[PDB]
Specification:
The protein is α+β, with helices and mostly antiparallel strands. It has three helices and two strands, in the order E-H-E-H-H. A two-stranded antiparallel ribbon has the order 1-2. The termini are far apart. This is Dual E2 ubiquitin-conjugating enzyme/E3 ubiquitin-protein ligase BIRC6.
């Protein structure tokens, strides 16, 4: 069995169905610098976490999509 680990989440195998958005949520909650170039995992041998907000989600949460619809 292969398990993915992150240094911030020390000594904790990551669930195989987490998806990278949820992992980014964890790492940002764990003080990983925002916009860090890459997710550095270790292949050795939390699913409820919300996915990180997409740019579209932020744009809509600021009401941008209503602005788009007024120009469609």
């Amino acid at each position: 069995v292969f398990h993915l680990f992150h240094k911030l989440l020390a000594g904790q195998p990551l669930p195989a169905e987490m998806t990278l958005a949820q992992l980014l949520t964890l790492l940002y909650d764990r003080k990983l610098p925002q916009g860090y170039r890459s997710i550095d995992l270790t292949v050795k041998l939390l699913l409820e976490t919300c996915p990180i907000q997409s740019p579209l989600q932020v744009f809509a949460g600021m009401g941008g999509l209503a602005l788009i619809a007024e120009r469609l």
